[PDB]
């Protein structure tokens, strides 16, 4: 139902003594304006696929997402102090403008003369403590989108989290007729538009918007795994990928008429997340996580089991509980093989095509592995050189995460959902 | 006045999207209005070295 508690969690130190952000990155982040509550500050629109966006200070989309989460974690420390002022202290030479947190600006000279603010690492804050934010209901809905997104990123040391739900009651009224309008579009475009639309006005659960976004997420994840395809469709709908396993994948919604699957009645759901560091170069997973955060902004999803998250991420009043659903992790290289196996068994794809798909996937994985390791080591030398401006351009990862995890179990669970 | 042709108003426990075809044609229903965009086909042609 409607969410009753609004809480969020900040980012944690990766062994440093401060938030892994500095003045240069903070200044370079603000490209769409002085407001950190805009979608362009988080994402970008390539509009043609077939490419990876990179920069000197922002190597990857995951890099941008992590840096923005760090910036928000650092800046929100100020207004949530018990004194509740918003411009009497500075964080890395930035201050808030106006009590409604409209924008971030360079600090005044006297604030600059005053000492900066020391920020703790893993803090959980409630949105109702701030007087203005508690007083204005329309105000919360605009910022809780980003708050939910950063919380879903910072809950676990692995990649972002998504939500998958299968149910037949969602197809209640003219939802089928309305979804029939999305046939020609791509998943990235649909997700971008839906993420933008969420902030226009408050919406209620069980609404057409919520049912649409849940159905779209479920369809995308089922097609990604391979449960539903051209010869096995979920009410004639299925997502098709032009070349599986490529560096930049394009998924397009599509219709197949006579072939349709059988779905048992009831309500089923789970959570999924990628564990390989490869997710930093895949926009689709990030978009799905952002859409899940938008959904969480207005709805109350089932809680998350404590034992599936680190100790600091336990017993959040609205996110984690004593007994909850497990988190399912995977790696893209193994998911490609699972997809190919299911399609070959169903007869859509042949052995030779599977062979080319596997080879291309291996090449892509090697390329991304090399690039990520190079950028990580470069960050290491920069941190060694400068001891007062420590920073991370990308979320830290370990060598262990590069291997197979629970991919088979998660694929089996997703297949069991249908 | 035939009440059966105004079911969604007369009937107190009918879903707002119920029709009674082909036996009875109702005269009060739910209509969906749209506004699409139809752009022309645009292309930029680049030469190959």
């Amino acid at each position: 139902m409607a969410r009753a508690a609004f809480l969020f969690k900040t980012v944690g130190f990766g062994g440093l003594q401060n938030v892994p952000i500095n003045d240069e990155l903070s200044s370079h982040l603000l490209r769409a304006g002085n407001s950190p509550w805009q979608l362009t500050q988080f994402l970008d629109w390539i509009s043609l696929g077939r490419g990876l966006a990179t920069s000197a200070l922002v190597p990857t989309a995951g890099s941008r997402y992590y840096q923005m989460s760090c910036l928000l974690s650092g800046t929100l420390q100020i207004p949530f102090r018990p004194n509740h002022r918003w411009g009497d202290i500075r964080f890395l030479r930035l201050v808030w403008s106006a009590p409604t947190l409209d924008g971030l600006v360079v600090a005044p000279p006297q604030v600059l003369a005053q000492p900066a603010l020391q920020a703790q690492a893993d803090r959980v804050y409630d949105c109702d403590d701030y007087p203005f934010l508690a007083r204005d209901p329309r105000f919360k809905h605009r910022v809780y989108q980003q708050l939910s997104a950063v919380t879903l990123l910072n809950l676990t040391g692995f990649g972002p989290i998504s939500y998958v739900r299968v149910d037949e009651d969602m197809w209640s009224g003219d939802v089928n007729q309305l979804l029939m309008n999305y046939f020609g579009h791509t998943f990235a475009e649909i997700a971008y538009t839906l993420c933008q639309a969420s902030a226009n006005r408050p919406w209620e659960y069980d609404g057409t918007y919520a049912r649409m976004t849940q159905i779209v997420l479920s369809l995308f994840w089922l097609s990604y795994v391979g449960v539903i395809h051209q010869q096995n469709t979920y009410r004639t709908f299925y997502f098709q990928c032009n070349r599986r396993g490529d560096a930049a994948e394009v998924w397009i919604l599509s219709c197949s008429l006579n072939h349709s699957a059988q779905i048992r009645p009831g309500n089923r759901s789970l959570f999924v997340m990628p564990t390989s560091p490869d997710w930093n170069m895949d926009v689709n997973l990030i978009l799905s996580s952002t859409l899940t955060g938008c959904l969480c902004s207005g709805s109350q999803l089932p809680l998350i089991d404590n034992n599936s998250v680190p100790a600091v991420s336990r017993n959040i009043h609205g996110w984690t509980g004593r007994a909850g659903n497990q988190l399912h992790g995977f790696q893209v290289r193994r998911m490609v093989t699972e997809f190919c196996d299911r399609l070959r068994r169903d007869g859509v794809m042949t052995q030779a095509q599977q062979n080319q798909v596997e080879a291309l996937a291996d090449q892509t994985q090697q390329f991304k592995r090399d690039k990520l390791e190079t950028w990580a080591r470069e960050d290491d030398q920069y941190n060694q050189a400068h001891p007062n401006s420590t920073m991370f351009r990308t979320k830290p990862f370990t060598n262990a995460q590069w291997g197979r995890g629970n991919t088979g179990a998660t694929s089996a669970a997703i297949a069991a959902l249908i | 006045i035939p009440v059966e042709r105004y079911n969604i108003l007369t009937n107190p426990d009918a879903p707002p999207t119920q029709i009674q075809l082909p036996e009875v044609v109702d005269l009060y229903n739910v209509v969906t209005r749209y506004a699409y965009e139809t752009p022309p086909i645009t292309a930029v042609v680049m030469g190959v070295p």
Binding site: - | P22, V45, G47
Partner: protein, 245 residues
């Protein structure tokens, strides 16, 4: 194309209108009446030989530049999209035509009938042709077309089931291609409208049943369109006399 394999050369190409599970009049298409596979066309050998013997490239040719400059103006005037839309319209029109004709002819097409209580006759080729011509003009004016649409079908027994094409080898083998019809939204809507008409005939000005002519004089104010049961007799009423030709 077959180099010198005589047993596999093509000889005849034809088009058929009837389904494969029926026996009908053999009505071959006009294309089969050619001695060659297609319409003959003569050429001059001297020009071809001269062209083969005397040709040259420009002294400064770059294929990339030449073909870019040749492709760019050509593709700026394409019509493939309009052609695709016209193709969809044509397929819809053919399906609706066969569906409608099956309801007034003796065609064995498996479609449910809803207006069989309305009197009619067993139409022949000319009657079906006139009806189909009216349908053609109706759809053409509805979709603002001006060029051909189903005109070739309106020449000889428009009563048809499904279109197919064939060609024949010299040794006697034949190859037959039968496209798979996906469906017609217009035909489905027409069927739904007929189903509704089956119950809403009065709103369209049509009355169902029979009439009784006889003198009734009274001051009662019952409507003649809802007569009392005391004034109606049927084929089972005792004393009634039934007449034939």
């Amino acid at each position: 194309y077959v180099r010198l394999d005589r047993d596999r050369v093509p000889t005849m190409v034809g088009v058929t209108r009837q389904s494969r599970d029926t026996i009908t009049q053999p009505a071959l298409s006009l294309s089969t009446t050619n001695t060659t596979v297609g319409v003959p066309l003569a050429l001059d050998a001297r020009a071809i030989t001269v062209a083969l013997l005397s040709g040259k490239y420009p002294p400064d040719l770059v294929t990339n530049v030449w073909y870019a400059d040749a492709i760019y103006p050509m593709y700026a005037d394409t019509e493939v999209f309009s052609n695709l839309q016209r193709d969809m319209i044509t397929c819809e029109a053919v399906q609706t035509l066969v569906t409608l004709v099956a309801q007034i002819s003796e065609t064995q097409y498996p479609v449910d009938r809803y207006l069989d209580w309305i009197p009619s006759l067993r139409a022949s080729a000319a009657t079906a042709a006139t009806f189909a011509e009216w349908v053609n003009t109706s759809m053409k004016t509805a979709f603002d077309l001006s060029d051909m649409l189903l005109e070739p079908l309106l020449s000889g027994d428009p009563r048809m089931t499904q279109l197919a094409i064939q060609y024949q080898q010299y040794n006697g083998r034949t190859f037959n291609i039968i496209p798979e019809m996906p469906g017609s939204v217009i035909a489905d809507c027409v069927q739904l409208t007929a189903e509704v008409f089956n119950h809403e005939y009065n709103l369209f000005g049509i009355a169902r049943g029979d009439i009784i002519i006889g003198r009734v004089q009274s001051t009662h104010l019952w409507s003649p369109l809802a007569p009392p049961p005391d004034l109606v007799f049927d084929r089972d009423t005792p004393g009634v006399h039934i007449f034939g030709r």
